[PDB]
Write a structure and sequence with these properties.
Largest sheet of chain A: 6 strands, mixed
Chains A, B, C, D: Helix-turn-helix XRE family protein
Entry title: Complex between the 80a-Sak SSAP and the SaPI2 Stl master regulator
Number of strands of chain A: 9
Structural class of chain A: alpha+beta
Keywords: Annealase, ssap, Single Strand Annealing, Single Strand Binding, Recombineering, Recombination, SaPI, Bacteriophage, Staphylococcal, Complex, SaPI induction, SaPI2, Mobile Genetic Element, MGE
Oligomer: part of a larger assembly
PDB class: gene regulation
Organism of A, B, C, D: Staphylococcus aureus
Largest interface: A-B, 25 and 26 residues
Order of helices and strands of chain A: EHHHEHHEEEHEEEHHHE
Shape of chain A: flat
Distance between the termini of chain A: 18 Å
Amino acid sequence: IRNRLSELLSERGLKISRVAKDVKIARSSLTSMAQNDSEMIRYDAIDKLCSYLHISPSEFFEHNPINFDFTFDEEPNYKINDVFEGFEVTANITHAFSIENFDFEILVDVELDNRQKLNFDLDVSYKETEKITNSQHRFIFTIKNEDENIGLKKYVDSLSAGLKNLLFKKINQKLSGYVSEIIVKNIDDIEELFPNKGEKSTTLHKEILQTDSRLSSDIFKE
Amino acid sequence: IRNRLSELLSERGLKISRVAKDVKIARSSLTSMAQNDSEMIRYDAIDKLCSYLHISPSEFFEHNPINFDFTFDEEPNYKINDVFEGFEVTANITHAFSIENFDFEILVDVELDNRQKLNFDLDVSYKETEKITNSQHRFIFTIKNEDENIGLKKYVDSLSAGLKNLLFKKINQKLSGYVSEIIVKNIDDIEELFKSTTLHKEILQTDSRLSSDIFKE
Amino acid sequence: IRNRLSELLSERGLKISRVAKDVKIARSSLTSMAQNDSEMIRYDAIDKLCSYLHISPSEFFEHNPINFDFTFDEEPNYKINDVFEGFEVTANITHAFSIENFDFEILVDVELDNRQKLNFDLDVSYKETEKITNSQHRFIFTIKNEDENIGLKKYVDSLSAGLKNLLFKKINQKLSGYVSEIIVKNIDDIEELFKSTTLHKEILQTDSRLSSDIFKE
Amino acid sequence: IRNRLSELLSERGLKISRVAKDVKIARSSLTSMAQNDSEMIRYDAIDKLCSYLHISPSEFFEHNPINFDFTFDEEPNYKINDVFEGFEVTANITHAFSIENFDFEILVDVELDNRQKLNFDLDVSYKETEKITNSQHRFIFTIKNEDENIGLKKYVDSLSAGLKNLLFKKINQKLSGYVSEIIVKNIDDIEELFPNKGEKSTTLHKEILQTDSRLSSDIFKE
């Protein structure tokens, strides 16, 4: 499920600030709720927004009964070589360390409208530490058994594009958090000797937690 | 905005505990959210309920574009009479005191789907005290200018029964807090000594309800 | 899941001690495991029993794919009445107190072999207290909504007699622990002037059993 | 006897973690019980697994009435020369010492379905300290009278492959424990002067106990 605020105001052409001025809702909370990322919503908010946009909650709440629940391995098969390439000198994840391999299993329960639930196992392995910017990097993972989970992809693409993007976000966020958690327990705190361009000094921990690892596979293209 | 989980469960006879077990949600939260009492709802909760009940969020969330806002006079016209006798024998606010007058105007903007909204002013004066329990009494306020609020009644009963009840609950709470704030400041503490509860706490617990043809429920 | 060691021994007339000697297993463990009371079984034990009894583990372990799960209300509807008199003279909880009301719903999921499972809600209220012994009394709870549990009876008696008895034992223990936890907190310990007994301990020892057409044994 | 979990989930293709998520059983305990190594099992576990897999305990419990009980010599004929080749410097069993000879008798009281039990004596002698890895070694033993115990082999191979593997495991484990026990009593504690690659320092004792001696003979091929 997700609110369609982003799609609604894109269609209307209105801006979040403009809506906030109209419905007396805090800009930060409203803009966060505009994104599907927010997990909690207020009844006052749904009343004010549905009235302002003159629309029933039907158009506000995009719901598909297919629920995708994800579970990760308590213990993964992870090897992380430590390369002491002056991380403190240069705040680059590559300089701090490198993932030799990171493979594990993601348990995906694809529940249909009926309680009948289908479980798909994902052998996901670290592939490359993609460098998005000179400042930060994004870890990239890949599903070895993605061809086996072709039915999963059929179910994923069977949803709306907005809901597909919401799943991709959820998967990425869970995976990022998991990977950062494992690495931060495996790698000792490496603080940056020099604050970068007046930005307060940030430790490797802050960098890896900030690091967002998005899975890459034909199962999840967009 | 009206959660129909409660209605839906009455339709299907499903016990709240049964739903909570199936959707792995706390019974307390589910029961609080059942009558749309809680003003916050989790996306996970509604997703799970919709999938479990085989419904679109339309049957869960019932919304009428019409909106009602209520603004109370900053200064009301109130007169107080304190008997100070009898609260000690039995915990009755009326024995302790009563409000001789409490007439005040309450703004009520009934907003149409069109941006234009209609402002209606209702003057409610202290009518009597409802003896809901021998211990708790709820102040009753009657609308004097119901003529100006003839269209109010039409707008109020134009909403669903659940929505009407919601409105009645909100206005009742708001009125109760308003009158309690106004009165507790002018009232001393009396000990029940059945215990020995402070009359202040009795003022806090005592509520008030608008009895009028415009709001019969 | 039903160990038939007990049944098998009754078939062959073999004394538990005789089997324990032949298979070099402790009599205490073998007798505890005989009625499938223990929830842990050693691979060595079952191997030795199967070889000794000339049986496949099929005749030892009887399993019905059907599964029963029981969830009790987090908050039950219970009222307590404490006489406080009599328990001292004679060790009877009845004299010490009794439960005026103890109605609560138990959500029971009977799971079929197919992944789909059937949820049935039974409401059990305090019916009376069973005087099993002049000293120990077991609370009796009757199912009010047995109509919703007509299929529950069919599923229950669809299982083997041993499995039925197993279920009855489990539900009885669970109900007894539930009611004891609920009551001991609202009850004080009475020490008999008369050998001396504590009422809390009596609450712990006192059990409860669901007397209903759905569970007659 | 052994549970057929490994064979069951191999046939199903499911993973232990996937089963654990389904039957609400702890991953570690379930994965251990998936292996035939676990000696204890819970009735709740057998109920949940048999139901999840929709199978009777018949398919869950592979039982063969032929019971193989093993007994070892209280006192063996063992000679262990001590070579002080810097074990503390290099954590290799060869560097710590070397088995001159280790021969003894392994009594096997094989029991058929009937109480009739046949006993087979195994003159087992140390043959070679096989080096599995640069880090650890596996002691290899051999049965001198294996040709005499040809009937024993006939009984061993008369069982299922899974049960045969379970026996091999049991024999190996008992033999390893026995050999490590004898050696640790015969060889003084040699602690490693340097922890190996950040692994906390491990003493010869930990190495020999970790050392797993698997018997090698035509009686037990797989």
